Amino acid sequence: PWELTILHTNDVHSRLEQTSEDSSKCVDASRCMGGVARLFTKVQQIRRAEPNVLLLDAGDQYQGTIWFTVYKGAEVAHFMNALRYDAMALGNHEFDNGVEGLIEPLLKEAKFPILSANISASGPLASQISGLYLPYKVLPVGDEVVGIVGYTSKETPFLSNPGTNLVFEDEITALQPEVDKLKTLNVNKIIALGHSGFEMDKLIAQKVRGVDVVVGGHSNTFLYTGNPPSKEVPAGKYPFIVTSDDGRKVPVVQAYAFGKYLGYLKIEFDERGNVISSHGNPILLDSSIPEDPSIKADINKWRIKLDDYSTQELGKTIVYLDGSSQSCRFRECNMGNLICDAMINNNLRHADEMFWNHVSMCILNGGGIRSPIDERNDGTITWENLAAVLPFGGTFDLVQLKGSTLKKAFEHSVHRYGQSTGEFLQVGGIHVVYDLSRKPGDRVVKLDVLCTSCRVPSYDPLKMDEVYKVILPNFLANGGDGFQMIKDELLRHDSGDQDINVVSTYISKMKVIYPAVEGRIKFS
Amino acid sequence: PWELTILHTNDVHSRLEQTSEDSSKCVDASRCMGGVARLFTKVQQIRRAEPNVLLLDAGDQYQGTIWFTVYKGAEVAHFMNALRYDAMALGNHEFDNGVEGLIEPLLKEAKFPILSANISASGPLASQISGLYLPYKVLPVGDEVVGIVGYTSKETPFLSNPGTNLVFEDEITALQPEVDKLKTLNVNKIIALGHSGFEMDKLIAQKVRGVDVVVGGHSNTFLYTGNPPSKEVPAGKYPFIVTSDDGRKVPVVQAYAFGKYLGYLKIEFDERGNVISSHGNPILLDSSIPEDPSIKADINKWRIKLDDYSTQELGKTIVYLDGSSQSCRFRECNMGNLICDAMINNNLRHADEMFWNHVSMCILNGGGIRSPIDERNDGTITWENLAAVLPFGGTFDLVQLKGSTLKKAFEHSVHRYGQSTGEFLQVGGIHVVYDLSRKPGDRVVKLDVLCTSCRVPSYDPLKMDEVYKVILPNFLANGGDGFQMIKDELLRHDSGDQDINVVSTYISKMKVIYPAVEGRIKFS
Ligand SMILES: Nc1ncnc2c1ncn2[C@@H]1O[C@H](COP(=O)(O)O)[C@@H](O)[C@H]1O
Ligand SMILES: Nc1ncnc2c1ncn2[C@@H]1O[C@H](COP(=O)(O)O)[C@@H](O)[C@H]1O
Ligand SMILES: [Ca+2]
Ligand SMILES: [Ca+2]
Ligand SMILES: [Zn+2]
Ligand SMILES: [Zn+2]
Ligand SMILES: [Zn+2]
Ligand SMILES: [Zn+2]
């Protein structure tokens, strides 16, 4: 049999440095995980041992830490080139800086192919970008070849800033003719590498004839065979076996996110490229694996410009930014309003004639706001100041919630009001009135929401059966602060931009800010 | 006797072209007035006839039309140089583009002295600006000399953008030692030329010993001896005679605004520089005076870049901008909210530790909003589009109003509700609730206002005895739309920036706008 070792990462999201167990800042080095210097050690060890190795990335290297804010993808090309990645699929967050922010730092500087079969360009962009990403690449591996076919979330226009000159086609529709073309070119081993999420990965494995393996991402899916090595709870076995429409067993893999794990799948192929067997497991990149000293020293050199950037003025405030618990856990606070306005600004995407913007609404746990910012330092706001407000390394995500779910979340917001608890919600595009004399669960007396399917934004009563898009912290999307109804009832969840970066970009855009408390939250 | 003819302009406010009778756009050329080409004809005629002539400007050439938006003061230096002005005092609006926007287009390019005795600089600015404006200039006139001593409103920090490196001193305190110094240098004829308003001009005439004549501005004061030639109603005789503390009769002059009139005062001096007599009147620059063909042709050449600018994209909207009468005369309209947000943004000035900003509040007659803007032209907004919304050539002014006055204005706003009348008010920094079932004059049931003397802006009930700063159209400050209570009860009024320019700057700053209707105005 011909044996291939697939090593794979996805949704690394700017975790160039080692992290804590929860993928936020590394505080206790001896317990820290991931980062590219540790990944280099482990990939080097595996490449010593296994003859036929591919190292693949399923997208979303962009967006997540100050590394991306400052280096804008140059860090991705540089450190993925140092690791000698064999191929990468485009993720949604590779469009966060527009097509121009993908072409210049990443497509022009990567020394490996960057893939997506379901993105097409029109106009002058088509000539500008031609061949800078590819539908597939055929790579030599020992004396064999392997075809790698890329794909990217059809939803990317709602989840990033790709512009109006790219079209994201249905994945399966685009992939099939490319896979059939590779078989006519005598390429009998085919990996589908792409960035649409675990549910679409299973559909691709099921329906795209000739795909042997699916390496996916986007959904931060953790798969494992056995007792899990850390806190992540598996969504299924590694690999996840799909039975294809033509009767083949097709492994589907993913490797969580944030560079915490290295995916590792061993495939045995027969002479005709049929999979005989597949087995493996993600490897937890814990402190038992040393950081490569060379890569670490390069990371430490690149860190200097981050430390310099962290104390630069982003913009000014002329108002005290009240991020105190005594305000933000009890009533509308102007820091809360600022953060939710930045969250809605971050989620302005290209719109139909059918909506002014696809999302208008924001909730934010007040316990997630961890500092005020004083305006008496000549009004300056720095990244360092924002990192005190937002220290947890979260994201501002996009969910779809029925009105009934969101009414339950606002009841939960005040169910035990008066204890300085974190679940009290700050808001944008929502006006809420509580009556704290009512029974817990019946305290919301008015709840009005800003329309999306309207040319003039205005407020209407929340409808229990209607599904709303909402921007909220990943902490809440995952049921933090007791919001089990959000986790259990949400209809869609896509991870968004780094919390600090959302607020820093908005302050930079606005130059001078003066958020008010204006009656988004009232008590009767 | 030695006879001097003083020709003088003030508060020209970018009226380079001839205007209508009300100083807005010229529509019927045969009835149009002012403009620099007509002023040139009349000044040339007077200089043929009178041996001893000074042509003086008392400030506020900057700000008023698209000329200033595009040329940023280059037009002022160029056309005041073509008219051969002898001297200009700095006005408050000469600081609208900061000190840098005064130094580069105007102070470096004017071929006449620019004066102010009561502005001092500190730090590196002092060395940068030294001698580019002067406290006074001694000018030869025939075989005599005349001293011209400048002054500028002490209030300029609240009325423009001078920065924190200039100090505006009390006028009389600064002027006196300069006037006494000129008398020690055998300069016995002294004109005080400056920009503080008619009330301060009278105080200067009264209290600054040795001033022979005061030529003023800022307050747009029209003075006339006799039956007035047009629609402006005189505030007093021309000249206005002040009896000085030392017993002299000191003429005070001003010449309205907008280049409609040329001030003309004849002074007879004795050998010791004592005024024997003074007489004159402003000259209405009507269509009986021909536009100089050379200056007109130069104006027409400079107009090309204005016409080009007028159709350039300033920014984008993703929302319909609802400037319809059916909205803006009946309820909160999002165009109204946009314009009032731009008015408050325009009035962000340097603040104490005592306020986040000196003004927080805005009212705008809904009948003053004359068009919507459709978002379906790729979202583009041009100056031409804004000029359809705001066609009247007004300004957004700063007034001080007692709470009682403003409550009367909100009652007037709905006194005859339901007829599509213009007085219905759009707002910023005010939340109002009407109950239209109540009697006219008793329909305002809640009126809350955004604090200024606060580090976190928030809303509190309006207080009847408290004096509020409010930004509002000059049309309303002057009692338009029946707001006689505003005109009759206001405590302070300063003219502000051109209406169109306020909105264009805000849209340019914001890049992408999405104003909502959000409950600033409600009906019970
Ligand atoms: N990882 C997290 N992301 C966001 N908010 C968090 C996170 N961890 C804790 N919080 C917030 O912090 C509050 C607890 O803060 P404290 O009462 O100061 O210990 C919780 O109720 C949450 O609102
Ligand atoms: N010069 C002006 N400046 C501002 N608003 C004005 C001016 N002239 C008229 N208006 C407004 O136009 C309304 C009359 O418009 P209309 O009913 O369309 O004739 C008035 O009630 C005012 O609100
Ligand atoms: Ca095969
Ligand atoms: Ca004298
Ligand atoms: Zn991701
Ligand atoms: Zn993704
Ligand atoms: Zn003026
Ligand atoms: Zn002025």
Residue numbers in the entry:
A (entry chain A), B (entry chain A): 26 to 549
From the paper:
CD73 hydrolyses AMP and is the major control point for the levels of extracellular adenosine. CD73 is a non-covalent homodimer, which is attached via a glycosylphosphatidyl-inositol (GPI) anchor to the extracellular membrane.
The structure of CD73 in complex with AMP was determined to 1.69 Å resolution, and the AMP substrate is well defined by the electron density indicating full occupancy and no flexibility. The adenosine base is positioned by a π-stacking interaction with Phe417 and Phe500. The N1 of adenine interacts with the protein via two water molecules. An exception is Phe500, which exists in two conformations in the unliganded enzyme and the conformation with occupancy 0.36 disappears in the nucleotide-bound structure due to steric overlap with the adenine ring. Superposition of CD73open × AMP with CD73closed × AMPCP showed that the base and sugar moieties superimposed very well, confirming our structures to be a suitable means of studying the binding of alternative monophosphate substrates. In addition, concerning inhibitor development, it is evident, due to the optimal superposition of AMP and AMPCP between the open and closed form structures, that the open form is a suitable means for studying the binding of monophosphate nucleotides other than AMP to CD73. CD73 has a Km for AMP of 10.5 μM and a Vmax of 301.2 U/mg.
